[PDB]
Design a protein around this motif. Structure first.
Motif, PDB file in Angstrom:
ATOM      1  N   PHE A   1     -39.559   0.619 -35.386  1.00  0.00           N
ATOM      2  CA  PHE A   1     -38.965   0.113 -34.476  1.00  0.00           C
ATOM      3  C   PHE A   1     -38.631   1.010 -33.293  1.00  0.00           C
ATOM      4  N   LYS A   2     -38.475   2.369 -33.750  1.00  0.00           N
ATOM      5  CA  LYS A   2     -38.059   3.385 -32.709  1.00  0.00           C
ATOM      6  C   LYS A   2     -38.755   3.201 -31.328  1.00  0.00           C
ATOM      7  N   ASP A   3     -38.052   3.089 -30.239  1.00  0.00           N
ATOM      8  CA  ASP A   3     -38.477   2.985 -28.986  1.00  0.00           C
ATOM      9  C   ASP A   3     -39.061   1.487 -28.572  1.00  0.00           C
ATOM     10  N   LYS A   4     -38.667   0.496 -29.388  1.00  0.00           N
ATOM     11  CA  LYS A   4     -39.220  -0.612 -29.038  1.00  0.00           C
ATOM     12  C   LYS A   4     -38.012  -1.648 -28.675  1.00  0.00           C
ATOM     13  N   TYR A   5     -38.537  -2.408 -27.754  1.00  0.00           N
ATOM     14  CA  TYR A   5     -37.661  -3.413 -27.201  1.00  0.00           C
ATOM     15  C   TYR A   5     -37.484  -4.596 -28.561  1.00  0.00           C
ATOM     16  N   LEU A   6     -36.195  -4.959 -28.836  1.00  0.00           N
ATOM     17  CA  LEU A   6     -36.128  -5.981 -30.001  1.00  0.00           C
ATOM     18  C   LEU A   6     -35.481  -7.403 -29.484  1.00  0.00           C
ATOM     19  N   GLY A   7     -35.953  -8.330 -30.260  1.00  0.00           N
ATOM     20  CA  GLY A   7     -35.085  -9.528 -29.991  1.00  0.00           C
ATOM     21  C   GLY A   7     -34.864  -9.885 -31.544  1.00  0.00           C
ATOM     22  N   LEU A   8     -33.369 -10.045 -31.504  1.00  0.00           N
ATOM     23  CA  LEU A   8     -32.627 -10.442 -32.697  1.00  0.00           C
ATOM     24  C   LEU A   8     -32.345 -11.964 -32.794  1.00  0.00           C
ATOM     25  N   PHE A   9     -32.913 -12.435 -33.656  1.00  0.00           N
ATOM     26  CA  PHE A   9     -32.743 -13.882 -34.112  1.00  0.00           C
ATOM     27  C   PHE A   9     -32.171 -14.252 -35.011  1.00  0.00           C
ATOM     28  N   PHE A  10     -30.751 -14.839 -34.735  1.00  0.00           N
ATOM     29  CA  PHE A  10     -29.604 -15.204 -35.652  1.00  0.00           C
ATOM     30  C   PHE A  10     -29.942 -16.424 -36.228  1.00  0.00           C
ATOM     31  N   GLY A  11     -30.291 -16.871 -37.322  1.00  0.00           N
ATOM     32  CA  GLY A  11     -30.580 -18.330 -37.794  1.00  0.00           C
ATOM     33  C   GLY A  11     -30.561 -18.603 -39.155  1.00  0.00           C
ATOM     34  N   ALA A  12     -30.826 -19.538 -39.689  1.00  0.00           N
ATOM     35  CA  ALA A  12     -30.801 -19.941 -41.070  1.00  0.00           C
ATOM     36  C   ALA A  12     -31.713 -21.158 -41.373  1.00  0.00           C
ATOM     37  N   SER A  13     -32.237 -21.248 -42.588  1.00  0.00           N
ATOM     38  CA  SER A  13     -33.237 -22.517 -42.971  1.00  0.00           C
ATOM     39  C   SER A  13     -32.331 -23.712 -42.570  1.00  0.00           C
ATOM     40  N   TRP A  14     -30.904 -23.640 -43.152  1.00  0.00           N
ATOM     41  CA  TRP A  14     -30.195 -25.090 -43.136  1.00  0.00           C
ATOM     42  C   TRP A  14     -29.737 -25.536 -41.703  1.00  0.00           C
ATOM     43  N   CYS A  15     -30.299 -24.884 -40.559  1.00  0.00           N
ATOM     44  CA  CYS A  15     -29.694 -24.951 -39.381  1.00  0.00           C
ATOM     45  C   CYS A  15     -30.632 -25.573 -38.609  1.00  0.00           C
ATOM     46  N   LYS A  16     -30.744 -26.718 -38.256  1.00  0.00           N
ATOM     47  CA  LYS A  16     -31.786 -27.902 -37.811  1.00  0.00           C
ATOM     48  C   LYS A  16     -32.317 -27.239 -36.479  1.00  0.00           C
ATOM     49  N   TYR A  17     -31.634 -26.687 -35.416  1.00  0.00           N
ATOM     50  CA  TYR A  17     -32.049 -26.345 -34.231  1.00  0.00           C
ATOM     51  C   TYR A  17     -32.517 -24.962 -34.312  1.00  0.00           C
ATOM     52  N   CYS A  18     -32.111 -24.248 -35.461  1.00  0.00           N
ATOM     53  CA  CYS A  18     -32.512 -23.031 -35.787  1.00  0.00           C
ATOM     54  C   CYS A  18     -34.325 -23.057 -35.921  1.00  0.00           C
TER      55      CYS A  18
END
Length: 169
Positions: free
Chosen positions: A32-49
């Protein structure tokens, strides 16, 4: 012991995990060095996640080089596993990540932030950004124009800097 503690730091997050047909795999974090990242904060129990996964699949179609990383808040490892197996995203190992929420002042779930190769925040609230179609060409333009000044990370470990530098204080 400083040495034992700092070896862990230099080795912090050296693997990200993902599933390939009921098979948990790992990849060197060096990928992942030198790469654009998208951090997805979520969880299985989270309906709109769970519904947000559909937005992330569209995002990945249009931004294949932005690497999506799941930051988990699942209740159980079994939920974590089934969430990885359904999304096929990269993920941090199952652990407590409230400290990443606090560093970036994450209000609630789901959240999505876009990170530059040198660990700057390109888009803080990307979850709202990826909702209507104008975002595609605008974000293509934002990424194309962004000037990456070089940054040296502590322990030359990009995830240690991104998740554990003290700058939020």
């Amino acid at each position: 012991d400083k040495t034992a503690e700092y070896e862990k730091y230099a080795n912090y997050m050296n693997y990200l995990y993902y599933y390939q047909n009921n098979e948990l795999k790992k990849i060197d974090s060096s990928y992942f060095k030198d790469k654009y990242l998208g951090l997805f904060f979520g969880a299985s129990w989270c309906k709109y996640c769970v519904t947000f996964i559909d937005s992330l699949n569209i995002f990945k179609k249009n931004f294949p080089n932005v690497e999506i990383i799941y930051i988990p808040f699942d209740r159980t490892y079994q939920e974590y596993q089934s969430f990885l197996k359904n999304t096929n995203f990269y993920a941090l190992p199952f652990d407590n990540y409230l400290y990443i929420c606090k560093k970036y002042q994450i209000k609630n779930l789901p959240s999505f932030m876009l990170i530059t190769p040198n660990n700057n925040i390109l888009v803080k609230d990307a979850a709202q950004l990826i909702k209507t179609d104008e975002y595609i060409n605008n974000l293509k333009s934002l990424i194309k124009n962004y000037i990456i000044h070089p940054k040296t990370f502590q322990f030359n470990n990009r995830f240690f800097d991104l998740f554990r530098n003290l700058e939020h204080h």
